[PDB]
Curated annotation (Swiss-Prot), chain A:
Domain of life: Eukaryota
Whole-protein coverage range: 196 to 340 of 427
Subcellular locations according to the entry: Nucleus, Nucleolus
Oligomeric and partner information: Interacts with LOC1, NOP12, SIZ2, ULS1 and WSS1.
Function: Required for the processing of the 27S pre-rRNA. Probably involved in the step of the processing of the 27 SA precursor into the 27 SB intermediate.
Coiled coil region boundaries: 39-70, 96-145
Name of the protein this chain belongs to: rRNA-processing protein EBP2
Post-translational modification: Sumoylated.
Swiss-Prot record, chain B:
Phylogenetic classification of the source organism: Eukaryota, Fungi, Dikarya, Ascomycota, Saccharomycotina
Biological-process GO terms, alphabetical: endonucleolytic cleavage in ITS1 upstream of 5.8S rRNA from tricistronic rRNA transcript (SSU-rRNA, 5.8S rRNA, LSU-rRNA); exonucleolytic trimming to generate mature 5'-end of 5.8S rRNA from tricistronic rRNA transcript (SSU-rRNA, 5.8S rRNA, LSU-rRNA); ribosomal large subunit assembly
Domain Brix: 4-191
Compartments where found: Nucleus, Nucleolus
Part of the intact protein present: 28 to 239 of 291
Protein name, as recorded: Ribosome biogenesis protein BRX1
GO molecular function (one): 5S rRNA binding
Swiss-Prot record, chain C:
Superkingdom assignment: Eukaryota
Binding partners and assembly: Component of the NOP7 complex, composed of ERB1, NOP7 and YTM1. The complex is held together by ERB1, which interacts with NOP7 via its N-terminal domain and with YTM1 via a high-affinity interaction between the seven-bladed beta-propeller domains of the 2 proteins. The NOP7 complex associates with the 66S pre-ribosome. Also interacts with NOG1.
Transmembrane segments: none
Residues of the full protein shown: 153 to 253 of 807
Note: Present with 2680 molecules/cell in log phase SD medium.
Protein known as: Ribosome biogenesis protein ERB1
Stated family: Belongs to the WD repeat BOP1/ERB1 family.
Record localization: Nucleus, Nucleolus; Nucleus, Nucleoplasm
Function summary: Component of the NOP7 complex, which is required for maturation of the 25S and 5.8S ribosomal RNAs and formation of the 60S ribosome.
Disulfide bonds: none
Length: 145, 198, 101
């Protein structure tokens, strides 16, 4: 595996990015980070965080570079175009999220209605006792004079 | 300044998951051309010439389990074969994506890309192959999604994330995600001596 | 393209004075600020180029030119399309020129 072949291939393929504005390149090399600091890639959780950080570094670099240039960065949200995910896909995802929320609400109601039914008689008795005690206290205070 | 085009070709046997992956790749890349099928290998270069296309992506598959990908410059450039194993399609509801179709992508390459000449070669190939030209016919002005590439354990991982703001920015994972290995590198487009072999 | 918008319904941008953003991200101000009389005239007597669907670059109807309509009509009734070619070229017998031995 001689490096000369790929070196010659690069000599023809490599473009003079350094001699042109970063807008043409539109690529950020997140160097200085060897990506060896990922804790237990096999955990399936730290790998995602490492990729998120590596992408955030490039995002910040691109934001700074494009702010150096005059190309707008933020989407005004007033420009409507063909989103990669069709409106049907977004509606389906919203429906899935609503289904998850409904499941959470159903669990909350299942963990409250049974207790309310069980304590309904106790709640009524406690309320009646409290009201009667308040009435007796008021009557005694009136009679105390 | 930068101007590039990509040709998408899929051989018989591409399952619906791989077909959806190719379709969403063609949507993320606005300078992409799609072809019906391919049968047999050097003919691929002619197809790119018919469209004056500067790049070609071929999704080979020996069996309908393991996807394979070829990235090359059709005229006389080298080609690299990727043995993709993991694959997540664009039709997954776990990721919420409002990315503009064909908008400018932002790349993210770690230091491993510069650690070897062939790593640099693949980095450049991804940069110009996946980097939409600023003045592409079907591109879009605003920037809404970014592309993340990280290589660990000798294989390159591909991730994509959408950007978001608030009333200072945040991003959420979008698009397909998979892992690609380096199998074989050829000096020429679908030919020549085998420079590198794992 | 010149508009950067895909196959999305034109219902949007009706209230705004622009139609999307072209390449490099600048507003495409709406030029179809016609008059009521012009709209009514084009409604009863539809223009020869009238096609119904609107253009992505402006709210005005994407009226087709008379040349395009001529080609459409030629195709629609089995007329010649690639003009300037003789439909009755003589049979140049290239193979008969040679003789077998």
């Amino acid at each position: 595996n001689n490096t000369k072949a790929m070196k010659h291939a690069l000599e023809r393929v490599q473009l003079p990015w350094k001699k042109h504005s970063f807008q043409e390149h539109q690529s950020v090399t997140s160097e200085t980070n060897t990506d060896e600091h990922i804790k237990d890639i096999y955990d399936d959780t730290e790998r995602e965080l490492a990729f998120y950080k590596q992408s955030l570094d490039a995002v910040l670099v691109a934001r700074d570079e494009l702010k150096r240039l005059k190309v707008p960065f933020k989407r005004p949200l007033d420009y409507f175009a063909e989103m990669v995910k069709s409106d049907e896909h977004m509606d389906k995802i919203k429906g899935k999220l609503i289904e998850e929320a409904s499941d959470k609400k159903a669990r909350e109601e299942a963990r409250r209605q049974r207790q309310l039914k069980k304590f309904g008689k106790q709640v009524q008795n406690a309320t009646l006792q409290k009201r009667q005690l308040e009435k007796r206290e008021t009557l005694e205070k009136i009679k105390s004079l | 300044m930068n101007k590039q085009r990509t040709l998408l070709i899929s051989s018989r046997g591409v399952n619906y998951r791989h077909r959806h992956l190719i379709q969403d790749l063609s949507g993320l890349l606005p300078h992409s051309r799609k072809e019906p099928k391919l049968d047999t290998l050097q003919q691929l270069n002619e197809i790119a010439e018919l469209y004056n296309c500067n790049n070609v992506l071929f999704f080979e598959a020996r069996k309908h389990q393991d996807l394979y990908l070829w990235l090359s410059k059709p005229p006389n450039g080298p080609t690299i074969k990727f043995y993709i194993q993991n694959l997540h399609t664009m039709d997954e509801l776990n990721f919420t994506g409002n990315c503009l179709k064909g908008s400018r992508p932002v790349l993210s390459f770690d230091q491993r890309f510069e650690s070897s000449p062939h790593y640099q070669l693949i980095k450049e190939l991804l940069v110009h192959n996946f980097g939409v030209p600023p003045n592409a016919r079907k591109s879009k002005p605003f920037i809404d999604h970014v592309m993340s590439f990280s290589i660990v354990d000798d294989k390159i991982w591909v991730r994509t994330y959408e950007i978001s703001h608030s009333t200072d920015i945040s991003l959420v994972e979008i698009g397909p995600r998979f892992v690609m290995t380096v199998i074989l590198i050829l000096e020429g487009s679908f030919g020549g001596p085998k420079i590198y072999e794992n | 393209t010149q508009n950067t918008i895909g196959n999305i319904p034109l219902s949007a941008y009706d209230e705004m004075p622009h139609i999307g953003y072209d390449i490099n991200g600048k507003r495409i101000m709406r030029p179809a600020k016609g008059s009521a009389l012009d709209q009514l005239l084009d409604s009863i007597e539809l223009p020869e180029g009238w096609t119904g669907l609107l253009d992505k670059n402006s709210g005005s109807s994407l009226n087709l030119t008379k040349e395009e309509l001529e080609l459409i009509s030629k195709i629609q009734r089995n007329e010649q399309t690639d003009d300037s070619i003789n439909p009755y070229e003589p049979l140049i017998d290239w193979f008969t020129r040679h003789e077998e031995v």
